[model samples]
Target: KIQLNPVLVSTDIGKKNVAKNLGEGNMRLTGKLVRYGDNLTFSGVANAGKELVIDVTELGYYTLELTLADNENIIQTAVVNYAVVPEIIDEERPLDMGVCVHPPKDNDYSKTFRLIRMAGFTRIRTDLAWEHVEPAKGKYVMPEHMYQFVSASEKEGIKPLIVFGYANAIAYPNGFPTIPFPTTEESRLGCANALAYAVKEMGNRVTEWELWNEPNYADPVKDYLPLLKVVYPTVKKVNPDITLISGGGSGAGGGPGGAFIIPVLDAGGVDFQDGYSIHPYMAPNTPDFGYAGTGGPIPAVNIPTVWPYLKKISEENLRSDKKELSVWVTEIGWNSTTNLDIEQAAYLARTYLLSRRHYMSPGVFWYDFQNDGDTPDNIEHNFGLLRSDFSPKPSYQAAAVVASLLKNYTFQETLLDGVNKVLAFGQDGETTFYTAWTTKAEGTTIRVKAPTDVDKLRLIDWQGCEMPLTVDNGYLVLNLSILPQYLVVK
Candidate 1:
């Protein structure tokens, strides 16, 4: 039997079974075979059997480097109908690069997946209510479109992170009907059964899953924790390697969600899952400020109050054996109703770059993928990277620009020396890519030394278009309107 790693799942770092292609030619496919040979027995995309020159013992790992066709390829192997995307994924610096999507149930999903991949997003997060699957008590269903959604996302190479939520009216009739916080053993077991059924149905296809959305707004210790206590173990028993992320935490740290999460951590709540997530929404005043407008979000949001003690708590609590847990901002964005599209786009770029470099975050997901409504004035209707019609907003292009610029790059170091903010990115040790900006409201200038012995350099702004700059004695003197500038040292 030959096994290939799962193609579509969580893009989180260390969550294994990740494969994605950038639509470029010749992608490297990696996997292990129970028995190796030059039989060319393994299959390629579109049900074609392609030969490979591999002969070794199944010890640690093995790889299959694929020279892909011009179009996307889904390689299903012998014994298992596994779909392998001809993409590059890093085990060390895995970028859970993504956006939040809320698509209609059982509708055309290919259009959505195509647009998301075109925008250069590698992951998409969406939710489904428990009733959507289990309409009646002891009656479960996996609609044909559910499988269709998984197939489309897999073919496009964008990983899907699904959030399971709400209580079924027939199943949990007594407790929090729409939100899924259990009140009795019957409701708890019903919720657990639904979660386990999903794992069995699509565990191999879409692995990374979330428990609930914005539990910080509800009763964490009283209602939410008890439900999690029942659901976590049942889901884990289905697939031990399947990652479960808790606390779809809303608002900035120590702000609105402060009362909710602190108690859970005090009760050793963080020990329950793999990663703890936060919303960390700072807008109207840009990501530089904290929820609404607090000049004191120094790490913006009282993270010093939120997560600093988390490492200590996890190390000392029941989950001390799980070791250090990672934190993610699963939802964060600004509404166009409050700011201009260009301003929101700038926040998108600046926040994502600074997040992983400074904040101890491995992944940061935008608040949404497509606009929820066409109305221009409503805040909830406007937080999308795509317009209501699925058109590219300035924010969408900004995301693609980030993916293109830092394609194979990872964080290197910070070169801040007072007046400016300069973060470097590279592979191994050399710092070739950089981002520069300043926090001051007024425009400021900084002298950034050019790369040594470089033939050319491209100084680009937030819009993905290029601009010219003054070269002063091999030092590029640039004025910062305080937006973000991506500098490529050729």
Candidate 2:
């Protein structure tokens, strides 16, 4: 057994050796080989270089530097210990991608932000729970640790899309878990004061805000509307430029996209909100296609069908024929259990590209940052792109790959649709990148006519690795499987 230095364990998620304040520079990791083992080895990154060595091989103690940005390192004597050198990039890029991150229990914001940075995400969808900020009546105070989280997130170039989730216990004593939305003058005023205070305190640190988190549980017309009507103007007075989003619907079937949103639209909810948000997680199902949620005795809806449905409603209500309004998929992710990890990665990239093709606002925020638990079969525990142990799943790599390959690339159009979905992206007025995949498990082949200008092109898989591709005559043939891959000009 190799025992290393005591690693910071975040109390909330109970993540061991978490990326606490993982600052830059040579992070020296020293461990001792207590007993006989398979010698000692280093896997630089399970994704990148599969091996490494830059330290002592003495049968006693060893020291090494796990200092690689955007890579996960492991030190083991068959018993593994992981460490990450968090990378921070404050570059100006598209605000098109994001993930859901929770505040670390240890108040060490570095770990979550670092993980977010590694994925190349520029935005985060998290909570500013109503009760937590305002424990009293009119008085409100943002937690000190949250200030650190916001500062660190900004330094990492990730903007937060803060959600005003839940109802305050003090303000609405009976409405603790949020059944009856704040309707009374006193309750609505109290809610407005707290959110306005949050906006003022957060200042420029956060410019994006949401009215609630999945208000589908409440009647949008009677319950959710009153709260939004008051909060929008109050918060807007604090900062008019801030993106005050509304409609925190969770799904289309018995979720947000169904009847809950239509009434809100009827009551003129769009006038109060900059955009409408929904969470589309077709759990235990595939995201490669959309479904009708076959209304059997009880036919449910899927996540993929939620966005376009809402967008159609948005166009009709707002009197615009656009394919989509300023709607956003605030939270969405497919669980990756055991052998299903690769499929989850495919879903993440495919869904994001599809969202871009539909011109969804802000971005698709995966339901989580890290796994909430170790249960492989549990949907809640498996939503994280990183595992419960903070290891990079294929989904994590796919996130980074999507950001790197599509930086500044504008969505051109759907090159092809149906079972084999292919989309094009442009840079400098030319289609320079393409993403293609098949919805089937076995996969399918397609012959795309090679553009006359692209003499050389490269194929990138979901793992962020470049694969070889050949152009057959004037037609470039590709065998796209369940995992989506990128085709870019070399």
Candidate 3:
């Protein structure tokens, strides 16, 4: 079962009291002092007239401690009390975590399960087409093989983010034929009805339901809201805790083609889904169709825009009364064929890093898991973290380093110097995250003030190779050479 708790703490004080409503409840503790074992006290001289007030509203049960203090004497004593509430979620914990499905229809989920575990992902985004689940006018077919798929994924202890598309001809009669897709009420409901049946039966295991797949992309098949309106209610009826998601817009094509469709669904009165989805692909220059360049993105086509753009869209949505809606990057990755081999690993690593920086995306699925080929020598479909022969690439190593660095750091910042160079971002135990960068033949200089109590620094190359770094006069002098991305985490 899933458990959540929100707690608040308050106290009456003898001095000026600073009452702060901390992060939305489930954040666990209240009052920084209380958290770090410092006594929660309202001490110090009152000067003339001052009082302290501590008020707390807790979500679950909590233990309270009050301490009486004297500033002049510099001493305090404490007392403890307990508070409780009951709101246990008798449902299962969600584990859904990574990328897209490969082979389009591989009923054998064993490969997927293994791959997900290897990539350290426990979540999968799968689509259950309304048409595929229910075909005839009244009869519904539950695509039994998917149950095997779902069960196998669970066996691997992975959670699924199920996307139920409104139109799938295999399940719904003529569903595949729906255009810019279904502007009408009847067609959308028809799709929803089928979805409800599948979800109710599988609701016990399924936690999230994405309304549609890339509804704003080049070939939108259904009116997102109409379908969402019908499906959300139906699924909610079965499991109120089920998380509803909308806006799996493919974050491609910059002229509003990627992120523009999300707002449209928001405007259509579809207010109930829990989150939004996006497919972020960072493919280099569309016109040139090549990876190498002076580094300025080709307009109407920018690879780097995937993460930052999604963040902008998410922020816009938050500002527009959709504050509760969280954004999920359902898909984001780079594709490299044999021609792009030399820069393949580096590009892939950079793309992943950029996504982590710009989007702060809660979830990032790396396209497919296994190599799509019969022989190890075939690198055509080699997007797997492992090679076709199961060897890990430098890209994979770099990703591991970045992931490790993130454990002690964050998306502090980044730099985009000239056409193809830059340095950016620094971490200092929770202050303003500082970063700087520059590009071009003329190397740019950046002065960064080192954080206090600084320790050793190592330069991690783009492929995550660590090299010796020099620290002088509390200043880390970084020469912009042979360094992919460097971090000083101590």
Candidate 4:
């Protein structure tokens, strides 16, 4: 006989969440483990008498199927679900830090704007759905709802990045359902006209305009170019000072349809836009360079690695043309689920830091403001910094901590030496600061020579706690770990 014990288990990384069993002396345990959605699978021998340790490497739910058998006959089987929690972090971040939001349905625009301002964000990104602006053919009306929303943002001193996008019912011929891509020349002209109307109506209230949201989802490179050609001149005609951003794409590498920057540049799409945009969302527990096709001749889909690929494309595009192109990571964030809230917070800070350092992504927006729904297990509903009830999560507090640190400071340099995976030297006025952390799991010690002009040295931990520090032998010694810490030198 064979019977499994502890059918369900929840554990964090680096811990053994086990499922053991009682079986005949001669029986052996065999099992196959699969992580849902991730396509990760593992098959190995399971020890019967000893505890069957399951390595929960990644965050989220896992299912393990086990079978016990003697050499002669199969005996019993068991299944288990393993839940792996994510590790968590920080305060003050740079002014460039922003978050994506869906305006409240009840029209309390002031309240939503207030919440964003109070959270230390100076910018917010919202959707300017074309469908809302032009519902019927040849008739354009600026919705009162968005008018109030835009006014409320400017009123609260929040800079809004209006993501103007999606298909209007009017854009399609013979009337079709809402799609991201416009199919006909008439549809393209309609989109351009709508964009112009939006710029004219919104005026200087919103200067930044994103062309579309993920065109690669439904359209090819050639299909999108004409839309840009139509909309770009229309928007400029309305207001030349308005900053027009190219449509953000879903993928980072080269090829047709999916590859955003490369394909757009190949199609001569850079001539009409002020900046190129991308949406790079990496899954939790995966390293920045861990994914296949991530770092090589072309680069993979992860955030840090993908930027170089975009940079290469953008620079090459600039060489052949006089048009200036700035790379902006318009949207990026990890979902808060499977107890990975802490990891989400850490990634938020790390991604912002790396993006700013490497790609010069002027503004990095967290995917959303508040949870979309109450389902804890749903990835989409949990990307927000605030819960559905508008309460802050660890990620919210961490972003606040980063904002406090980088808001006024300027980046000086980054030091990725040996075990010292740290960003060095930030200056605001006369004060100098350094943010230090190890990407590696095992912590390491880093020694730095303190600047002679410094009179005080303090340590700011992940939660923004300040502690006095002393320099030993004219050196500031730091035990850098996975959690990021800030060193203030004054």
Candidate 5:
């Protein structure tokens, strides 16, 4: 009894297009597939009331005639069209690969969504401001601008992971609350209501919801938990399948240790969240960044590389009888304001690769999509993958390269080659992807033993340039530099 017309499917190889029924009754379903014209290409009976995947191998307009029947007679017939393109593959990649984006300042969400989709991203993260959604108490309105943006993202096959928070001025302890964190019960209830309303309004457009941005820095977990207790239930009552993400935490000044996360677990707050979120941003001093300073206590470790610490916290949660939670790095990026563009790009690429390989995080969202400003010294302005003028930066190209090569791959393990650090990954358990980079700008060369029956290797640079690999004496020789290098083993 559910109906949708003109369903869009991606052209990526082996991308599955799924359809399901939400209505009641014992229904039987059948589909007649026709590509390009009305001539039937294929026909088959589909399982009713279950998610069914349709194959989209070729590019073009395809149609499916969905017929539903009960025990007696045909109940309803729905026709669905699929517009497939080889350029944009369906989201077969892991769900954890996402990027944070804001409403386009130019109001051209179509362009933004296309660019994001072209990057091979499966998820898109955005903030749903409570103040914007519910300006006055007991009154809620969906912003037309945001609705268009979310709709555009959905059309492009990008999942929207909404950060549904921020305090409404009318419901806050201070009438005009400046910060996003709510303090009082009245304010918390209002915020929860706004979230529930958003779920009602969005209706299947969004499912993953982060309670707030960074509760650790804005409002400590102890206070945030009270608000979460109210928000979690309110959201579930509307959409029980929603993924509740804990507000991201930036490890307090020291490192991404158990100190920050353990408290939340001990408080029984993990019960409210499906995933633990964190923002592990740190200054770049690794040899990979060519930091030439005498080691005077390197400030902090890279966010993506700090997995052991994060994994420890997950283990601690397990000891406390809490269900193991997926770690979601909701925000992490390097600022081009202080670092070079290439450095930012290299860091972004390595960070993402290492985050998955080392941390086992299902998804890591880059902090931003586009530059916020033209100010050279502004950190916020420089974190964007795209510039203020909507131009692609080196970081954008690097991330695109990553998306193109490893979008369908899973992180296998970190490989050991003497003192050199190499990360290994795979796609569909066949194609091998190995990435290597160093901290020194001068670059260092490392030799790796070929992983069995591999005749040729292709090297993809950080900027996405491709080249043939040079193998010598059953060993693959690669020069590691500040810029990351990727190898495809056959």
Candidate 6:
């Protein structure tokens, strides 16, 4: 015995005075869920001038249909036959980084600089690549490559995080991490000396120094720790103001012959480094990897593992961390070729969201800003905001929108029709922007009421395209032409 359902939604400023005020800040909202004896009703109110959205999830039902209406008039509706609850996990450990060779001197430095600054990147990790800098042991030389790269980055206002270790002539003349781990006393001291020389040369310009790249992934913990400890003090002496970072394990799953996080932490094991860099790459959620292209990869264990999967690295500074160990996301990104544009955008959005939301660290640089190299290796290229040629991708637009919306957002919650799963928010000032998502198959019509005397109402799309929206009787109607997806208003 099932009954018909009715729902009411309002976007009035004064109708929600009854919902307990949530004070001011960003708010989290739960979606509307209903069980109708054939009939169901969903009604809610959104504070005027704020972006509002409704997400519905079905937990117990064989078949279901959703209808969003206003004053008995149908506005949006959908039916779903298949759905799965996503797993929530965190990726913490070391900061993930996108190490790149500075483009050669002949390349346009200005263009390279724009890529870093425009990408919202604050920290960049590069290989000091001992082999390139110190060609011969004990002959410390400042190559033109370092100066060009450093000066170019400085001009663009992007900070550099340099990773040292491996094959600096003195340490690994063999040019590899697997060659029995450089055990001689002279070898150890020479390695530290090389790092100190390089850091001193660039220390004033770059303070973040990662001891080695994925040392845990190859050498024994004992061997790597000595190198890290020795280098830390030497680099400190060169520049006390600089930060000495260590540990860069690849991902959440796989491996152990090489140094992993626990092994390194167990070694002197103090979490004493200023920052820990990590590489968290989750393959598609297939059955082999988990749920076959549905969920993200999960890390084994660490501090970042405490947060959601989509997050970059969860916040580790406990406020109580009298030492405040800052974690840098040296490498964190999704593989877009295997996923749709929307999923790709979602991945990037979720990661950036976590970084800013949790204040995870000072800077969160997405991996591989540009796509280079040949096929397959070129997989890294798609992760950048622009193609190799410099055209924007949807990921870039989505990130930009998120940044814009966060300008001066304040959170508020609303409880309507005996349901407590709604959140309300507004911009702090007179002019506010609102964006909503309707998804691929759904269409949403948002009726908003703005200040009566407002002289203009503008609606801007994902691209910077702006159209003067009209407000009649104090209500501004936004009927966007987009797939059932997200929208923002300013």
Best by lDDT: 5
List candidate 3 segments past 4 Å from native. 1-97, 103-115, 135-137, 141-158, 174-186, 215-222, 250-267, 270-272, 285-322, 374-382, 387-391, 413-428, 431-455, 462-465, 471-483
TM-score of each: 0.73, 0.78, 0.60, 0.73, 0.74, 0.59
| lDDT comparison, 2 vs 5, better candidate | 5
The sequence of per-residue lDDT tens digits that candidate 4 reaches over residues 68-126 is 88885878876654433222211243567788988774457776676566455767888
Query: Which regions of candidate 1 are displaced past 4 Å?
Result: 1-94, 104-106, 177-180, 250-260, 291-318, 417-419, 440-442, 451-456
lDDT (Cα, tens digit) per residue for candidate 6, span 1-490: 1111111111111221112212123232212323221223233333223333433332111123444444465444443221111111112111221234336333666666554444344456666766565667777877675677788877755567777765454434554345534455666677778778898778689877877666544453656666666766777888989877666643234211112444554554444465565554543321112222222344332222423332332233222334645555566555556655445554564454334333344545565555453344445655654445444445554444444443334433221111111123344543243443332224445555553334544444433334466666776665532221122333
Candidate 1, residue 213: how far the Cα is off, in Å? 1.1
**Please, what are the lDDT tens digits per residue for candidate 3 over residues 447-471?**
3446434453445444333446556
lDDT of each residue in 1-490, candidate 5, tens digit only: 7444222334443444435654455776666556532242555544556654555444333456777777768888876554343343465554567898988888888878877776567888888888888878878999887688678977888778888775566645463254557767778788888889989888788877887766554544657777778888888889887777765553453224444456667786777766767766665444223222222323335543366556766766762345677677777777887788778877777776766666467778887888999999988888887776665566666676666666657777777532356878886666477888876667898778887544557676664445566678878788787767788775
lDDT of each: 0.60, 0.64, 0.47, 0.66, 0.67, 0.45
Q: Give the poorly placed runs of model 6, Cα more than 4 Å off.
A: 1-106, 169-184, 251-261, 266-268, 283-321, 341-343, 374-378, 399-461, 466-490
Residue 346, model 6: Cα distance from true site in angstroms: 4.4
lDDT of 2 by residue, 242-264 (tens): 87777775434434344555667
User: Candidate 5 local accuracy as lDDT?
Assistant: 0.67
For model 2, the superposed segments whose C-alpha errors exceed 4 Å read 1-76, 79-93, 171-180, 250-258, 294-309, 319-325, 337-339, 452-454
lDDT (0-100) at residue 166 of candidate 1? 66
Best first by lDDT, ranked: 5, 4, 2, 1, 3, 6
lDDT of 1: 0.60
| Candidate 2 global lDDT | 0.64
Estimate, for each residue in 166-222, the C-alpha lDDT of model 1 and write its tens digit.
657765578564454666777877877787888878976776777777754556676
User: Which stretches of model 4 miss by more than 4 angstroms?
Assistant: 1-93, 105-107, 170-180, 252-258, 285-290, 294-296, 299-304, 319-321, 427-431, 441-445, 449-455, 470-475
